[PDB]
Amino acid sequence: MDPFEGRMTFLQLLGKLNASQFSQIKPAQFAIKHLDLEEDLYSCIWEELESGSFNTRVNIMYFVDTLCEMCLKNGLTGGYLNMISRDICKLVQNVAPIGAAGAANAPEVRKVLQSLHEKKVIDDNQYKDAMATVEAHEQA
């Protein structure tokens, strides 16, 4: 499968996401099956974040959690895991920005951050930084 078909199919799968973990499984399996396209596919995730509603952004945050869990179940250590770890505070800024959406999404982003932290995708400093971002954006 070439990068273009990979992106096209993955974007369609991302369109299926909802709050349920059940909806996040198939896009996660695809992303992993085509790890060779990780850069393309990771950019698909950010494309959907940038143009998505706050509801869509939150569901992508859940998907990111599901993706990381499945990566770990597959015995992977880098790839998506390193990209998500590096970008964790950016992810928080997108899903829970300054203003009222930060308050509306704070508990849901906290749940994901705790999950990523417990599974050692993010370290203590990152978790502390990301949690402080959520608090700042909940309060203002």
CSV table of C-alpha atoms in Angstrom, one decimal:
chain,number,residue,atom,x,y,z
A,1,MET,CA,0.0,0.0,0.0
A,2,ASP,CA,1.4,3.4,-1.0
A,3,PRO,CA,1.4,6.5,1.2
A,4,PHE,CA,-1.6,8.1,-0.6
A,5,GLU,CA,-3.9,5.1,-0.2
A,6,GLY,CA,-2.7,4.9,3.4
A,7,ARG,CA,-3.7,8.5,4.2
A,8,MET,CA,-7.0,8.2,2.3
A,9,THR,CA,-8.1,5.1,4.2
A,10,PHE,CA,-6.8,6.3,7.5
A,11,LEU,CA,-8.7,9.6,7.2
A,12,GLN,CA,-11.9,7.6,6.5
A,13,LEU,CA,-11.3,5.4,9.6
A,14,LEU,CA,-10.7,8.5,11.7
A,15,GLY,CA,-14.0,9.8,10.6
A,16,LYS,CA,-15.6,6.9,12.4
A,17,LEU,CA,-14.4,7.9,15.8
A,18,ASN,CA,-16.7,8.5,18.8
A,19,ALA,CA,-16.3,8.5,22.5
A,20,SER,CA,-16.3,4.7,22.6
A,21,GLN,CA,-13.1,2.7,22.8
A,22,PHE,CA,-14.8,0.3,20.3
A,23,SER,CA,-14.7,3.0,17.6
A,24,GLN,CA,-10.9,3.6,18.1
A,25,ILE,CA,-9.8,0.0,17.7
A,26,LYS,CA,-9.9,-0.3,13.9
A,27,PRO,CA,-8.1,3.0,13.1
A,28,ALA,CA,-5.4,2.0,15.7
A,29,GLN,CA,-4.9,-1.4,14.1
A,30,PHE,CA,-4.6,0.2,10.7
A,31,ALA,CA,-2.0,2.7,11.9
A,32,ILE,CA,0.0,-0.1,13.4
A,33,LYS,CA,-0.3,-2.5,10.4
A,34,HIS,CA,1.1,0.3,8.3
A,35,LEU,CA,3.8,1.6,10.7
A,36,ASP,CA,5.9,2.3,7.6
A,37,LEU,CA,3.5,5.2,6.9
A,38,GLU,CA,3.7,6.5,10.5
A,39,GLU,CA,4.8,10.0,9.5
A,40,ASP,CA,2.0,10.3,7.0
A,41,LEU,CA,-0.6,8.9,9.4
A,42,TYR,CA,0.6,10.9,12.3
A,43,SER,CA,0.1,14.0,10.1
A,44,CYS,CA,-3.4,12.8,9.4
A,45,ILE,CA,-4.1,12.9,13.1
A,46,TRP,CA,-3.0,16.5,13.4
A,47,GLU,CA,-4.9,17.4,10.2
A,48,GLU,CA,-8.1,16.2,11.9
A,49,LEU,CA,-7.2,18.0,15.1
A,50,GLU,CA,-6.6,21.3,13.4
A,51,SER,CA,-9.9,21.3,11.4
A,52,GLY,CA,-12.0,19.4,13.9
A,53,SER,CA,-14.7,20.6,16.4
A,54,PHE,CA,-13.9,20.4,20.1
A,55,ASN,CA,-15.9,17.2,20.2
A,56,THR,CA,-13.8,15.7,17.4
A,57,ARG,CA,-10.6,16.9,19.1
A,58,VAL,CA,-11.5,15.1,22.3
A,59,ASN,CA,-12.3,11.9,20.4
A,60,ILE,CA,-8.9,12.1,18.7
A,61,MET,CA,-7.3,12.5,22.2
A,62,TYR,CA,-9.1,9.2,23.2
A,63,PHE,CA,-7.9,7.6,20.0
A,64,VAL,CA,-4.3,8.7,20.8
A,65,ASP,CA,-4.7,6.9,24.1
A,66,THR,CA,-6.0,3.8,22.5
A,67,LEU,CA,-3.3,3.9,19.8
A,68,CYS,CA,-0.6,4.1,22.5
A,69,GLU,CA,-2.1,1.2,24.4
A,70,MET,CA,-2.2,-0.9,21.3
A,71,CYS,CA,1.3,0.1,20.3
A,72,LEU,CA,2.5,-1.2,23.7
A,73,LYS,CA,0.5,-4.4,23.3
A,74,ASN,CA,2.3,-4.9,20.0
A,75,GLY,CA,5.7,-4.6,21.7
A,76,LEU,CA,6.5,-1.3,20.0
A,77,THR,CA,8.7,1.3,21.8
A,78,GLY,CA,9.2,4.2,19.3
A,79,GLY,CA,7.2,5.4,16.3
A,80,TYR,CA,3.8,6.8,17.3
A,81,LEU,CA,4.8,6.5,21.0
A,82,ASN,CA,7.8,8.9,20.6
A,83,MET,CA,5.8,11.3,18.5
A,84,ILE,CA,2.9,11.5,20.9
A,85,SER,CA,5.2,11.9,23.8
A,86,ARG,CA,7.2,14.7,22.2
A,87,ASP,CA,4.0,16.5,21.3
A,88,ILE,CA,1.9,15.9,24.4
A,89,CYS,CA,1.7,19.6,25.5
A,90,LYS,CA,0.8,20.6,21.9
A,91,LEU,CA,-1.9,18.0,22.0
A,92,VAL,CA,-3.2,19.4,25.3
A,93,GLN,CA,-3.1,23.0,23.9
A,94,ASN,CA,-5.3,21.9,20.9
A,95,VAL,CA,-7.8,19.9,22.9
A,96,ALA,CA,-8.0,22.0,26.0
A,97,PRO,CA,-7.0,25.6,24.9
A,98,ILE,CA,-7.3,28.8,26.9
A,99,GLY,CA,-11.0,29.9,27.3
A,100,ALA,CA,-14.1,27.9,28.0
A,101,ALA,CA,-13.2,24.8,26.0
A,102,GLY,CA,-10.3,24.2,28.4
A,103,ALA,CA,-12.9,23.9,31.2
A,104,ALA,CA,-15.3,21.8,29.2
A,105,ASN,CA,-12.6,19.3,28.3
A,106,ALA,CA,-10.3,19.3,31.4
A,107,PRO,CA,-11.5,16.1,33.1
A,108,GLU,CA,-11.4,14.2,29.8
A,109,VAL,CA,-7.8,15.3,29.0
A,110,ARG,CA,-6.8,14.6,32.6
A,111,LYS,CA,-8.1,11.0,32.1
A,112,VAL,CA,-5.9,10.6,29.0
A,113,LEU,CA,-2.9,12.2,30.6
A,114,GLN,CA,-3.1,9.9,33.6
A,115,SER,CA,-3.4,6.9,31.3
A,116,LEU,CA,-0.4,7.9,29.2
A,117,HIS,CA,1.6,8.6,32.4
A,118,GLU,CA,0.8,5.2,34.0
A,119,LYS,CA,1.8,3.5,30.8
A,120,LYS,CA,5.1,5.4,30.8
A,121,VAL,CA,4.4,7.0,27.4
A,122,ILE,CA,5.1,10.4,29.1
A,123,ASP,CA,7.5,11.0,32.1
A,124,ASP,CA,7.0,12.9,35.3
A,125,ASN,CA,8.1,16.3,33.9
A,126,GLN,CA,5.8,16.0,30.8
A,127,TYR,CA,2.9,14.9,32.9
A,128,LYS,CA,3.4,17.7,35.4
A,129,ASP,CA,3.8,20.2,32.5
A,130,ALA,CA,0.7,18.9,30.7
A,131,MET,CA,-1.4,18.8,33.9
A,132,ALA,CA,-0.4,22.4,34.7
A,133,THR,CA,-1.5,23.4,31.2
A,134,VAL,CA,-4.9,21.8,31.7
A,135,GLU,CA,-5.3,23.6,35.1
A,136,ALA,CA,-4.3,27.0,33.6
A,137,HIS,CA,-6.8,26.5,30.7
A,138,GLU,CA,-9.6,25.3,33.1
A,139,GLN,CA,-9.2,28.4,35.2
A,140,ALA,CA,-9.0,30.9,32.4
